[PDB]
Every structure is written in structure tokens, then in C-alpha cells.
Amino acid sequence: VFYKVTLSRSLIGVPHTTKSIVKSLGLGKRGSIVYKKVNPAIAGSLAKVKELVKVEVTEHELTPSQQRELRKSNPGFIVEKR
Amino acid sequence: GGLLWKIPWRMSTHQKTRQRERLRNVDQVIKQLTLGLHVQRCQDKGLTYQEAMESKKKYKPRSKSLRLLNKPSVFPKENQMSSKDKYWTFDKKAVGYRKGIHKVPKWTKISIRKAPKFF
RNA sequence: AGUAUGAAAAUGAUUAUUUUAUAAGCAAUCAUGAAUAUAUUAUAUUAUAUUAAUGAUGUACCUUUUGUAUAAUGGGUCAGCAAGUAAUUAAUAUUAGUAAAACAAUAAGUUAUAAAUAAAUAGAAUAAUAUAUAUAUAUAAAAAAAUAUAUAUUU
RNA sequence: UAGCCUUUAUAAAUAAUAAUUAUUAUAUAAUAUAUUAUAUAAAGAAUGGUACAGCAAUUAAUAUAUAUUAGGGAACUAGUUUUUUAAUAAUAUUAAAUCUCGAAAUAUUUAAUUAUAUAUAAUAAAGAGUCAGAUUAUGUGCGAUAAGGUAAAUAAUCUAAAGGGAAACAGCCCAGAUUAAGAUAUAAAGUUCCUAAUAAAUAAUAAGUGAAAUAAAUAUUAAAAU
RNA sequence: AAUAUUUAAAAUCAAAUAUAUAUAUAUUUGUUAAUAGAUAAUAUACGGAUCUUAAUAAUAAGAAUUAUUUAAUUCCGGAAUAUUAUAUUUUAAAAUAUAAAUACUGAAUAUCUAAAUAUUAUUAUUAUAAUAAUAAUAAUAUGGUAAUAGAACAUUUAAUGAUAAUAUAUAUUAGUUAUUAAUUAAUAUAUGUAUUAAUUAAAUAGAGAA
RNA sequence: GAAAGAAUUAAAUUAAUAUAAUGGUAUAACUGUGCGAUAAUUGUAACACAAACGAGUGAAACAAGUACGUAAGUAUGGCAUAAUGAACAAAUAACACUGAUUGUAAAGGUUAUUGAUAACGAAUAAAAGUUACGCUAGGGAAGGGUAAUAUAGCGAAAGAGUAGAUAUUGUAAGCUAUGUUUGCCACCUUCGACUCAACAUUUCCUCUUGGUUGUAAAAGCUAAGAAGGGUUUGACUGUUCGUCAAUUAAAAUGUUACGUGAGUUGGGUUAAAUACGAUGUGAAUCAGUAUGGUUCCUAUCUGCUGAAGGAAA
Ligand SMILES: [Mg+2]
Ligand SMILES: [Mg+2]
Ligand SMILES: [Mg+2]
Ligand SMILES: [Mg+2]
Ligand SMILES: [Mg+2]
Ligand SMILES: [Mg+2]
Ligand SMILES: [Mg+2]
Ligand SMILES: [Mg+2]
Ligand SMILES: [Mg+2]
Ligand SMILES: [Mg+2]
Ligand SMILES: [Mg+2]
Ligand SMILES: [Mg+2]
Ligand SMILES: [Mg+2]
Ligand SMILES: [Mg+2]
Ligand SMILES: [Mg+2]
Ligand SMILES: [Mg+2]
Ligand SMILES: [Mg+2]
Ligand SMILES: [Mg+2]
Ligand SMILES: [Mg+2]
Ligand SMILES: [Mg+2]
Ligand SMILES: [Mg+2]
Ligand SMILES: [Mg+2]
Ligand SMILES: [Mg+2]
Ligand SMILES: [Mg+2]
Ligand SMILES: [Mg+2]
Ligand SMILES: [Mg+2]
Ligand SMILES: [Mg+2]
Ligand SMILES: [Mg+2]
Ligand SMILES: [Mg+2]
Ligand SMILES: [Mg+2]
Ligand SMILES: [Mg+2]
Ligand SMILES: [Mg+2]
Ligand SMILES: [Mg+2]
Ligand SMILES: [Mg+2]
Ligand SMILES: [Mg+2]
Ligand SMILES: [Mg+2]
Ligand SMILES: [Mg+2]
Ligand SMILES: [Mg+2]
Ligand SMILES: [Mg+2]
Ligand SMILES: [Mg+2]
Ligand SMILES: [Mg+2]
Ligand SMILES: [Mg+2]
Ligand SMILES: [Mg+2]
Ligand SMILES: [Mg+2]
Ligand SMILES: [Mg+2]
Ligand SMILES: [Mg+2]
Ligand SMILES: [Mg+2]
Ligand SMILES: [Mg+2]
Ligand SMILES: [Mg+2]
Ligand SMILES: [Mg+2]
Ligand SMILES: [Mg+2]
Ligand SMILES: [Mg+2]
16 A cells, blocks of 8 residues: 655744655655555654645555646637637 | 734634644544554555455554554544643743643644643 | 037926825835827727826835844936956866877977885886785885786876 | 855765664464464663652751760759750651762664655865854753843754735744746635624623733632532 | 532543453543732824624624634544425425535645746657757756856957948837847938948946945 | 581772872772883884864784783783973984085984973064044944832731720731832933923822721821812022022922923033142053133924915805
């Protein structure tokens, strides 16, 4: 399984220790999403920063291309050339 | 004395509601971490996702941090906490040995759950 | 302080459009009515330009400071003038020429071609890579410390 | 000069950052009590003495119809009835910057593994600026448990940071502006009007108490446990 | 109903969690208010208005204070619906909702929608082709004083350098190019006219700050 | 059953350590003793700790020689942490390196050694004051915070009050209020008089009222409401203050940059002259004394006093 982890709260006032905890998880800007193969190491790293992230378990992971495809909005038209 | 840092001594209803939600969110993060570890243990043993979730026996975490965070006596859940300790934090330089949790720096990120038994 | 030209700005008077005599602050931005002007595709229920109805937002600029709307410094306005340049050298980097040589080409000379020592007449594989060799300290000679040289073609 | 910053690069390069496994014990099994395996519990490999806690040794304080020592209080020719002072024992209570017999969390830190590679560390050539700092929290020294005081120790922000909230606001809560757009989810803060946005439950207040900067000892009037 | 310490969740009691299926151990939470004391000097200062509710009584108010909370608690797999918009035809009213496990506002946050630049990958078109230009997709990044590092524009001068009053230069107004700059149109003045476009080399090369 | 051994266990590092304090020490690092006096020796020193540099600290290993030990081995001073000083220039010895035409010299170099720059990373071999005659370049390296002090109230009441803590009174200690005092910090570099005053109430007088063996009357003391009106002339002194004299119902306390100098004064206090007393050798100096003594401004804005014009009536 995978931990889908989202960086919910920012780091503009976070100690450098927790900031490194986050940076070592692959998380970037606020609202960033990453999937992590569930294991004790990542579990502990996320526990130490539980107050700045959101976590949810999932069967499978999604590559950024798939996440983009799911994020793209619905264009309300179909085009026929003339 | 001179500067005006007009921080009121007591929170408002909306602030209290937001604090309750934040506490609940941290509880949810801990719960999800434990559940993920359990499902991983089941899948390593051979089971699949569906009966890993439906398994009657839930595997407890073996790490110190997770075990302690799961103990209510160390990191009590929101519904377990007391109304006093939800909003007021322990200070030894204040009358009543308490101060509003909203006067703690970066209080929406850092977490306090437990104060001394008799304080 | 040449000549000619000169719708360059600051500045003054007058005219035109528009707003303004119940409304209060860096004078501006956005939102939005209304008047006017121009328009040889305004077909219009059009476009653009000018203008303090009205609404919201908005604490001049530099310097120096931990920090300035600051009642801290400097400025009445505009035009012109006003501040990292020269030689003589050393080191580093890039490209270009030539290349175990380069620059000069009258002779010289400067880098490179061998490391080392305060210096001296010492100076790099006994049929191979440091366990060999050179220098300095010590010499029977080695060992020991520090640098440096050797695995068709010399860098 | 070191520290903090910048440009260009180097490989027999992942050496960097973060977390996990380390331990002790129980149960149930095996294997061969001793292991191995699974599950669980414990603030969980090595180092340390702060909080807390304590009065051990040291330094200080209190008490006794209990004892040792000294002057020794109506009869008296050596020996008392005693809420007689001080010291030493006994017992019971206490504290401390330079006291820790107990003892945290954070912390220092080790190998392997996992994650971070559009990423760290180290090294080579070369170029600066800085060496007046300020608040807010938490431990402290000084001051008077004064100061928008002063001196240093951990974050964070301003410095050099626009934007939302704190009425106004360098330093507080949230969040880091390449340029637009404005549909969606929002952070802190709020939803009677000024001003974007709300409907309810259970108790208390009657003092405009209070409603975005809680003023003390005390006094009065009211609430229930036996 | 009378003599009536204390202001308490330690102890007890009551609800819940984790082990336990005939019951126990461990853990978490629940123990008062009002007034007085009160306190200065331009002007009352919750930012201001103002905020406590009440039958008859109309669409229709009753904290905008304090303390716990909900958007039904609830756990670590539930419904409870004055909602508002239905009726056959029934005739004191009548069938059915959405929408409630994530009410609402809210930033230059994040996503979506488009654009620019740099880099890491994959592509397409065109003429160190293992390149160059342009374009397309995924991902990351783009605040900034002191400071460092790339790139470009305006002015003048020197070298090379056609064209020409149907042109050039300058000025004003209105348009175009992602715009410190050039360009297109109209108008005005001067000039048979560029040290011109472009590449180099150089500066008395850019002023609201003395 | 008993002797003599070997010792073991508890306790002890409080004594002792060459010397402060800390850590260590009985397995002793403490003490006694035999040799000895040797390692309180020589040439390379890796690697670490510490660290800007310069310096500092531990030290494996190779080689030469010593002392102790049966041997294993130990010893490169002291159980450890202080016990110190750069380079220049001089001086002494050794080395056999260079010897400015050659030879020797002279002189330099290498190795060892000496003297202290205590403002102790040390300017030079060598150096104190004064300026109120002073000059230039800069920085500022009454308001604001605090409430120790001052003032005021409150709680409690030990004691006075012929009697009774609470008529009055309230002595050490407790809780607060003000920001008028004396100080504290370093964000921010005129005292008095004259004239005119505005504001507060913590009320001096005037009005209403409660208490007072301690209110018979009168005069009082204490307290609650109350800011409408009112609240001084003169001698001394620069004086605010203060001592007096004479009045008054009273002669209250404060805030306003301790109100008011683009409104007046310039007596005190602020420079240039001079003298006295003290300090100093002297220049000169003094929270000393005395005589004299140079700052001005035509009102742009706000505000205010009084006039007018335009206007929407
Ligand atoms: Mg009007
Ligand atoms: Mg005006
Ligand atoms: Mg300053
Ligand atoms: Mg400001
Ligand atoms: Mg001004
Ligand atoms: Mg100014
Ligand atoms: Mg000026
Ligand atoms: Mg040799
Ligand atoms: Mg430097
Ligand atoms: Mg201990
Ligand atoms: Mg201590
Ligand atoms: Mg690793
Ligand atoms: Mg400094
Ligand atoms: Mg300070
Ligand atoms: Mg920052
Ligand atoms: Mg600065
Ligand atoms: Mg800001
Ligand atoms: Mg508000
Ligand atoms: Mg604002
Ligand atoms: Mg109020
Ligand atoms: Mg309990
Ligand atoms: Mg007021
Ligand atoms: Mg953005
Ligand atoms: Mg930038
Ligand atoms: Mg950014
Ligand atoms: Mg110039
Ligand atoms: Mg100019
Ligand atoms: Mg400019
Ligand atoms: Mg100028
Ligand atoms: Mg010794
Ligand atoms: Mg000792
Ligand atoms: Mg180190
Ligand atoms: Mg060094
Ligand atoms: Mg010895
Ligand atoms: Mg010789
Ligand atoms: Mg000679
Ligand atoms: Mg000699
Ligand atoms: Mg000195
Ligand atoms: Mg010194
Ligand atoms: Mg030193
Ligand atoms: Mg001297
Ligand atoms: Mg004089
Ligand atoms: Mg008495
Ligand atoms: Mg007293
Ligand atoms: Mg009064
Ligand atoms: Mg009378
Ligand atoms: Mg005055
Ligand atoms: Mg006065
Ligand atoms: Mg003036
Ligand atoms: Mg005078
Ligand atoms: Mg004299
Ligand atoms: Mg005279």
C-alpha cells in the first residue's frame, strides 16, 4: 500500500529540523502530493511532522501524469472543423 | 508596556472550533499511519487489500513513536481531552499557572495535549 | 559674449470642453454614470479621447538606520553640466595561434622542460607501481616523516 | 582571518538529509532450557546529570515529660521531685547556583536498510558583502519576580517580505508576489449594519457585567455534601 | 427540615476507551456565580452604531455576553428531515424530494484555465544534423537589501555600407509588436538629404537625489 | 574438636596527593621499601583533539642508547587540568654549508642557548598636562518606559482614647492606585516674574447630609453628595518655596512641553574681562563667592477675535 501525503500547512515558521524532515519526504510547495511505499521509516518521518501534512492510505500510486489527467477540468465543447 | 500587541486573553468560539478540527486532523493522521502499517503487514504475510482492511486482528505498531502516540495517556485524542487542556496551556510565570493556547508561538502547527496531573 | 533657426521645459494671461458653492487628508489606481470631441465600413444598441457625479483602496521619494508618513537628512521648478577612468606590473579564467615547445627573430632575454634543500661538488624503475627511485633529516645501508618520477608513445 | 553568500567544474562518488532495526520481557509454537519464528508490552543500541524528586554524604533549620556533658534552683552530711542553657547521640520533620544516593523528554551519535536524485555532502580555480542588529515566545545572570532595560542560550519573523487577520501596526496568527484570468478547495480571522459571509442545542448572566489590551487582598449576597 | 469543615474527579461515583465473548485489569473525562473594592486633568471611546424581548399580535423578533458543542451526536458500520416545488382527489389538514459523515465569507495560498523564462525527459516541423530555430507534453523553479553571475536597449565616434523630395530627420496626436525601443497613419518645419540596416572597435555612453 | 595459613566479604577515596578548585585514585595515581639516579636521553614523527591565523594537546610506529625487572615489560619528567611572550637587532658554542679576482679571512647561513614587550598577538631605543580664546569632520551609539522613592486608598487591628481597638486615633508587616516628587533606562540631543489663562477634583470657603462616653448651646473633629460662584496685599530674598505683618468665607492641590520668551522681562543660571578662598609646580580649575555682559522675524497654512462679498431661496 501507499501513503498519499499532502503538504497542507506551510513552512514559513517551522524550525529547520522539521523543515528538513519534510524536505526529505520529497514534499515541496504547500499543497504538494506524493505517494510513499508504506514502511516504518516513512511512517516515522511522517509522524514527526504529522501537524503539517495530511495522510491517506491507497492501494496503488499515481504518477504525476495520471494526477494531471485527473486534475484537468472539463471543456464544455466539442470542435468540428469547417 | 509600550508596544500594543492586542492579543486577547481568551479565544472565541470560532477559534475554538478551528482548534478542535486541527486536533482531530492530527488524530486522523496518526490513525491513517497505523492503518497503513497494518495493511502492509497483512500484505507482506500474503493477504490482499480487501481482507487486510476487513481483518479482525489489527496489527499494532512496533515503533516507539507510533506506540506512544497511540497510547491515550501520552497523546490523548480530541474527544478524550479535557475542555481546559484543549484551549489553555501550562505556564509557570502566569497567575493560575495557565495561559491561552493561542498565546503559544505557531500554535496552529505545534501540538500540546498533556499538562501535569495536578496543574 | 559668432550666425540662423527654435510648437524644449519651468513660468504668465486668455479662450474652449468638463466637473465643482453640504464637503475633509501624497491628489493616484480601479469600479461607474453623465457631458463633450473626433471617426471616408458609427451597419449601431458603434469605437476612441478629455473631463474631481458617485463607490472602494491608498501613511511622497531618496539617505541612514534595529526601525521612519515620521515632527530624523536633502530637494521652489525646469534646461544644460556632474562621478570606477589611465598608464607600469603580478595572479586567475575563456577563446585564438603555435605546441615539447611559445614569444622574438641581429645578439640577448622571459616562461615551460625535475623534484628538493638555508646552502654545497647531490638529482628520479638493478628484467616495474610503490614494497622501486630522487631530495631533505639519519647514515654502514636501510627503516621512519613529507613531497615528487617511472605501467605505440616523451609533459 | 574564520563563519554566512556567488560563478565555473571533478569523479573507482551517495559519502549528505530524515526515519526504521538495534534492547528488556511475556505468551504461543516450533527447531536444536537455549535458541529460532510470530504476536504483544515497555519513553526501547552507546554517552550524559537539567527539570522532577530526594535529604543519602556536605552545607543549613525545627521539635522532644528520650538519653550523655556543664553551672547545678524548698529538707540537706554523698544524691532528687525538674513547663534550667548549650553541645553530642536517638527519633520525626525540612532546602541548596557553585548537593545529587533516584532520574525524564528534547539532545549528542554509530553501522546497515529504506526514502529524497529535476536532490545533498566533499573537493579544485576565482569573486564579494558582513563583523551597530530588533522584537515575540521559553529557560536564566544583573536590576526591585521594575522598564519599549541590559547580557548572553535554543526556534521564528523583520532586517532584505509584498498579500489576509490583529481597528490603525517592521518583529504577533496564516501565507512567500514570473504575467494574467477568476471557476473550484481553502489557511488565520470572521458571518446584525458600517463590511464579504449562519442557522441551531444545553446551562449561566441582569451587573451594558461583557462584547479584540481580564485590576489585587478583602467584604456582602447567593449554590450541596454529609 | 434543623446544628452545617470544603469550593474538590487525588479518593469515591457516573459515563466512555484497550485487552476480555460466565467478568475483571488498565486508561480518559465530569466539582460555582453576582456586586463592592475601581482610581485625573482638550472629548463619551467594545473601532462606531448598538447588543438582554413581550400574550393579544399580522410574510416576521427574542443576545450581537460567558461556558461546553453541533452542523445529529456517535465510533476507530446507523439513521431522526417544521425543508421548499406537487397530488389522485380526498372536501382538520393532507403524501415527494434535493441539502445535510466536507454550513458560509476569506490571501498575490493550492488546483483549473492561458502566457514567459531556465532546467530535466519525450516528441513534431524547417535548413558540433549527436546541432540551430520554432512549437507541443509531464515535472521542478522564478520576493529580495549588501553582494555575485548572465543578457539586452538608448546616445556618440571610427571601419565596411545601397537607397532618396513617391525620401530622410525632428515634433504632436492616434494605432501595432509582450513595448526603457522601434514601427504605421495624419499634420508642421528643414533638407536632393543618413557615418543609415547590420557586424565589429571605443567611449566625456543613460541623473529627483552630493 | 583445635591451631597456622590462604585469604574472601562489608566499609572506606572523609586521610593522602608538591601547590587553588574540579574530576580521578585502594586494581591505588596514597604509603613503605631494594636497586637506581637511569627515560628530567637522540633522528623521523602518522593520525587524531582543539582550531581563523599563529600557536596548543594526546600519541601509535621505525631507528640509537640507557636504568629497573627472573620474566612479562615499564620509563621521552611530576594522577590531570595553570606555572607564560612573536618577529627585528645583539651575544655564546658547535656544523662545514656560502666565502663577491684567487687563497685565507671578514660576514652570512644551519643546529643549540640567553635576556619579556604584565595595555601580556608585543607601534618607537626614546614622551605628561590645559583651553570658560579655541577650530574642522561626524554622532547625538523637556517627551517615552518603570514605579525602587514619593503621594493616596483599602483589608486586618497592637496600642492610646479617665471606661471601650474602630467619636478621634491606627506606629512593624499585607493588597493595590497616581505618574505631580527623588531616582532608574537610553527610543527621542531655562528658573523666577509680568499678561492671559483653559482643564481636573484628590473640595480650602459657600449649599445638602451621617457619626461623634468622645455632638447640651457655640466653636469643632471625622465622613458622604457637590466643580455653580469664589479662592490676598505688603517687608526680605533672582528665587519657585520659606519666615513674618495685616486682612479674608477661604487664603485647596494639581494638569496644560514642571501652560504661556515668532506675547514682554533677563533678576538667577550659560562664553569672552577682573578679584578673592581653595586645588595644582604650571597652564589653568571649582554642582565655590562677587562686579559687568548682544539674539532677532513684515504671518504662507491651521486656530482664534471681528468684518464683508458669492451662494441654492
Ligand atoms: Mg453640491
Ligand atoms: Mg480641505
Ligand atoms: Mg538611532
Ligand atoms: Mg510605519
Ligand atoms: Mg508635516
Ligand atoms: Mg522629511
Ligand atoms: Mg530643506
Ligand atoms: Mg635514502
Ligand atoms: Mg572573510
Ligand atoms: Mg546519578
Ligand atoms: Mg545547575
Ligand atoms: Mg546512509
Ligand atoms: Mg558586535
Ligand atoms: Mg533590547
Ligand atoms: Mg525569510
Ligand atoms: Mg541595514
Ligand atoms: Mg508584510
Ligand atoms: Mg473586527
Ligand atoms: Mg488593514
Ligand atoms: Mg463594557
Ligand atoms: Mg480519575
Ligand atoms: Mg476617557
Ligand atoms: Mg502562486
Ligand atoms: Mg529574483
Ligand atoms: Mg515566489
Ligand atoms: Mg556622463
Ligand atoms: Mg536633468
Ligand atoms: Mg528616474
Ligand atoms: Mg540636484
Ligand atoms: Mg602530583
Ligand atoms: Mg578530591
Ligand atoms: Mg572537529
Ligand atoms: Mg592548525
Ligand atoms: Mg609517580
Ligand atoms: Mg667544504
Ligand atoms: Mg675574495
Ligand atoms: Mg660564523
Ligand atoms: Mg598594546
Ligand atoms: Mg591584547
Ligand atoms: Mg589568545
Ligand atoms: Mg607611549
Ligand atoms: Mg573666566
Ligand atoms: Mg486600649
Ligand atoms: Mg504601617
Ligand atoms: Mg467627591
Ligand atoms: Mg454645634
Ligand atoms: Mg514651563
Ligand atoms: Mg506654572
Ligand atoms: Mg514657537
Ligand atoms: Mg545676567
Ligand atoms: Mg587666590
Ligand atoms: Mg555698567
